């Protein structure tokens, strides 16, 4: 019973076409210098750069209603720190070490899809596990996951295989938040597929 209002409606609507996906996809003008946005926003490729973590934001920031998008991040392309979430327009997108960049500061919120941990203003040790009752060593986030941002309640949560896993972060009302990830893997290809909005 934890779903945002209108999530089933949204996920059952005809999927946004490639045009819509590019409009709400990764921004070539808002990513790390070590990331190349391809296909007009449908995916990015992180260049091979040693001792760097690199982020990207979507083109569109959300302040109201419900928005969802699918991230596709091959399991073998995640490396030591693969973080999926949202950021304000001001979050840093690059740092010179391997780290959970997304969620390391005030401006970002991330789920570590290898460790299972949630980061916001967090360096990483002690961070809580998500979803409830799981732990890294005994879960595996598959290639595709949905990111679900409810800007009426002010929550960010995730869905896997069509199933919402609950609110991960709260307290987001009044912000303007963009899709975001941070990555460390040379030549990783991270795709984003916008699923639409309601509200």
């Amino acid at each position: 019973l934890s779903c945002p209002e209108g999530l089933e409606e949204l996920l059952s609507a005809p999927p946004p076409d490639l045009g819509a996906q590019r409009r709400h996809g990764w921004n070539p003008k808002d990513c790390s210098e070590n990331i190349e946005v391809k296909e007009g926003g449908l995916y990015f490729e992180r260049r091979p750069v040693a001792q760097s973590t690199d982020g990207a934001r979507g083109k569109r920031g959300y302040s109201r209603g419900l928005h969802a998008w699918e991230i596709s991040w091959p399991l073998e392309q995640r490396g030591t720190h693969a973080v999926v979430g949202v950021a304000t327009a001001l979050a840093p997108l690059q740092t010179d070490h391997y780290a959970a960049l997304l969620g390391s500061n005030s401006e970002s919120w991330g789920w570590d899809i290898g460790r299972g941990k949630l980061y916001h203003q967090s360096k990483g040790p002690g961070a809580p596990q998500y979803p409830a009752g799981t732990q890294g060593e005994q879960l595996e986030v598959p290639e595709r996951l949905l990111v679900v941002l409810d800007m009426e309640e002010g929550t960010l949560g995730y869905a896997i295989g069509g199933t919402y896993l609950g609110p991960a972060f709260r307290g987001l009302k009044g912000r303007t938040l963009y899709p975001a990830v941070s990555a460390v893997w040379g030549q990783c290809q991270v795709r984003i597929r916008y699923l639409g909005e309601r509200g």
Binding site: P48, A50, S52, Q77, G79, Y98, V184, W185, G186
Partner: peptide
């Protein structure tokens, strides 16, 4: 080459 994260 040699790096944990496929960077070289």
């Amino acid at each position: 080459r040699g790096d944990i994260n496929n960077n070289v």
